[PDB]
């Protein structure tokens, strides 16, 4: 939706704004044919592969990343099954004693 993290919430659930998928999937693009300033080995491996294997990285080309903090991955979250009224519905994990 709009500019400023477009269409803040729906106001129905309040909180943070919705996210549309946008450009979906494909190659990771070749990178600027080097991508490695010194061609260094960075943390057990060279810079050209890995050294940034993360599927989620800020491009400056979108407002998805905001600032500071971190982005939380909500697809995988270990969910307390039994708890307060709120609860995460269908739970991800369960504690079963001996």
């Amino acid at each position: 939706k709009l500019t400023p993290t477009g269409e803040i919430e729906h106001d129905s659930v309040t909180g943070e704004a919705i996210y549309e998928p946008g450009p979906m999937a494909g190659v990771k693009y070749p990178l600027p044919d080097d991508y490695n300033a010194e061609n260094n080995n960075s943390i057990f491996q060279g810079q050209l592969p890995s050294e940034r294997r993360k599927l989620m990285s800020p491009l400056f080309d979108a407002s998805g990343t905001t600032f500071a903090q971190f982005r939380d991955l909500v697809n995988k979250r270990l969910k307390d099954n039994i708890g307060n009224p709120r609860d995460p519905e269908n739970p991800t994990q369960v504690k079963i004693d001996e």
Binding site: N41, I43, Q47, E51, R52, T66, F67, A68
Partner: protein, 76 residues
Amino acid sequence: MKQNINIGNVVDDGTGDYLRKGGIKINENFDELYYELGDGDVPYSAGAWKTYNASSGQTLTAEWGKSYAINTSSGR
């Protein structure tokens, strides 16, 4: 005026950054300058061109200075 953060570095993929923390720094850097000369500036080097344009009142008010005219037509 030289007290500002370095704001992290690109070594390989690596780790230590602050990885978007640095705004609170990045701000101070800007926040150094735009407030270091902040209520004022240098008028002379940028206060030259404009008045080569018309004689109009050309407000320089309440900071720096503006219109040197550097050319003919009425001097403003």
